[PDB]
What does this fold into?
Amino acid sequence: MENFQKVEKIGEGTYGVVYKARNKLTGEVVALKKIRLPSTAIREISLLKELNHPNIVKLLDVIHTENKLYLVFEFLHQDLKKFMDASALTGIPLPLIKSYLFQLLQGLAFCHSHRVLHRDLKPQNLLINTEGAIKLADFGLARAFGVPVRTYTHEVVTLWYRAPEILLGCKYYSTAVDIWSLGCIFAEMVTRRALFPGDSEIDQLFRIFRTLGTPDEVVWPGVTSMPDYKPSFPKWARQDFSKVVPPLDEDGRSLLSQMLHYDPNKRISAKAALAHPFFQDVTKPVP
It folds into this structure.
């Protein structure tokens, strides 16, 4: 490319490496992602150039050159995974949990209003600044290519944040998949512990059943007709959420419960969740 100077590698996303880089012409400091290459990828990333929102990482340009796709992004400060790790002793304060959950729902509501799914929400894919904003990153190829099992580095793509409709092998995905993922992140921010740390598809599903109870045709009409559903699934009782995410207050447990509804058609929308009593006292603090 020979137009930007790489200052440092800052990450490996699902599809490619990411560099802090400095535009040699504009002095501009960017995040530069490089994906090794097909034409469908390029056309899909181009639609992202229009998906602008304060809670989506700003895509500044897309360059198809030399069997490579470079994405130029605005430069933020750290991923949420690092901030959660850094905070494991103290715990992220609630108003900041509340602020971040508010902003992510705002980002999802925008995406979902334009029928764009993230499909791979997780702390690794959320970027914060010093200003106390949080942003959706690493999405837009999922509609076309789905979610790979592994990264370009052959790292395992975590299942901890996958909706059960996906794990049970439904091949048509609603916006509800993102709400599940965000519910998982919410609980993790509170408890400083992954809600459903599965290491396999069936291990992920059984962790979900152990906490929320095994779904049946009552809670989830059609579920036992899912492609990968087995009548031989063990039948666990639903657990008290007071056990699951202490010491989250009643409004939090109630929002979370609606975010982890088994039936994607009963699961709260981004837009509904923004109206939830849990956000009545919402503010905007910083790390």
The longest strand covers residues 4-12.
